[PDB]
Amino acid sequence: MIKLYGAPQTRASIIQWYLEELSLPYEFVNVNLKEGEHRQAPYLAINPFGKVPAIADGNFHLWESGAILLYLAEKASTIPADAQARALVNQWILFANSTLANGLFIEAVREKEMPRLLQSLEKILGRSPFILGEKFSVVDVAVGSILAYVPIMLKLNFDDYPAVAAYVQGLVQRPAFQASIGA
Amino acid sequence: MIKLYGAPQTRASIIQWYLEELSLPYEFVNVNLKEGEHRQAPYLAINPFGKVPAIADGNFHLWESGAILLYLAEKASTIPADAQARALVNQWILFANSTLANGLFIEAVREKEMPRLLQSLEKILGRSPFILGEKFSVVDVAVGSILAYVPIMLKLNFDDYPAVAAYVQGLVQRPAFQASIGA
Numbered sequence A, B: 001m002i003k004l005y006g007a008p009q010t011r012a013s014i015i016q017w018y019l020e021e022l023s024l025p026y027e028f029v030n031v032n033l034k035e036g037e038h039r040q041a042p043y044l045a046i047n048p049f050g051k052v053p054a055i056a057d058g059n060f061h062l063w064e065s066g067a068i069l070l071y072l073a074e075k076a077s078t079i080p081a082d083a084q085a086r087a088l089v090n091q092w093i094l095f096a097n098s099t100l101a102n103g104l105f106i107e108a109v110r111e112k113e114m115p116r117l118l119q120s121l122e123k124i125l126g127r128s129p130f131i132l133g134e135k136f137s138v139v140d141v142a143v144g145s146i147l148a149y150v151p152i153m154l155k156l157n158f159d160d161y162p163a164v165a166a167y168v169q170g171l172v173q174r175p176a177f178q179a180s181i182g183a
């Protein structure tokens, strides 16, 4: 089965949410970041940058939460996809991991970036229940996890963006979310 | 041919570098960020977040520099790849766009993060000429572009990381780099 390397209160919870959505068994391998386990040779052989999450799937190892999400989504796919279909998913995963996370969580750019990001997401989410349309996908795990951390880590809310607020509420209420990030 | 939406001194030059490495033609379209052209309706219809770069490949549009690099690499591939081969490239692109760029360019985390990132890259680059081994790849465009910006924006050098220094020196001297980022 997949082995997920993580620690409490890290982005490993985002991978646990997607594994819950996919109903896939996995082994959770705790890495003791407080005592520096991630900086020793055994963990550096899994991720040479000493960060969690990472996964092992047999002899295959992979790190970066976004790449893990794309990998699990590809492995679970039942209909073969082309470079353009994968590209639109990759676009949103890169967005969640860079443009969105940076604009919300970097204090020096937050005042300018955060309202613009939320205003753009309000337009998208006001026209469809999920980012890619009518159906929930790995894109909602990637983007939704970052938005869900806003009340958690910044004590801020989405009161001025009702469609974003309803979207995040809908995600937090999902049983798979409550079993992982929401636990 | 691909249309590339970009602007001076932006990550659009990273896409131009990879297009030149692939010997592909492209129609470059300047978006006047200084005059707010990226916030007008025509550009928001391409990237709703108003950021460059973006591409159009016929009717298909795509934004996030990382997603564009992965898309161009997939389209130019002659040997069909599976989920694991794509995952390894996805890992490095996500790393360049998040972990690496943040650890080097965010002042509050640079002191702790930068030496760890450079020490890990130094070990990899001391063993092979490029990140994935003997051959130059899209990963070298993604990671190498970020490393090449360090002297430019931080007034720092790679004197204590000789393999990183020689790797960056080699990339900057590439004709395709000179025709794009170095132009």
Ligand SMILES: N[C@@H](CCC(=O)N[C@@H](CS)C(=O)NCC(=O)O)C(=O)O
Binding pocket: A009, A010, A011, A012, A033, A038, A050, A051, A052, A053, A063, A064, A065, A066, A097, B094, B095, B098, B099
């Ligand atoms: N862009 C990476 C970031 C991973 C990351 O920063 N992980 C943290 C915990 S959430 C970590 O392992 N920190 C340990 C350290 O930096 O020493 C991802 O999304 O996977």
Ligand SMILES: N[C@@H](CCC(=O)N[C@@H](CS)C(=O)NCC(=O)O)C(=O)O
Binding pocket: A094, A098, A099, B009, B010, B011, B012, B033, B038, B050, B051, B052, B053, B063, B064, B065, B066, B097
């Ligand atoms: N993660 C995005 C970042 C794109 C980005 O920040 N682009 C900048 C120029 S380098 C931009 O268009 N800024 C305009 C604005 O923020 O209003 C990517 O890699 O494409």
